[PDB]
Design a protein around this ligand. Structure first.
Ligand SMILES: [Co+2]
Length: 9
């Protein structure tokens, strides 16, 4: 999750 969001943002 943390990484996925880091990228999406
Ligand atoms: Co990434």
């Amino acid at each position: 999750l943390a990484e996925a969001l880091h990228d999406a943002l």
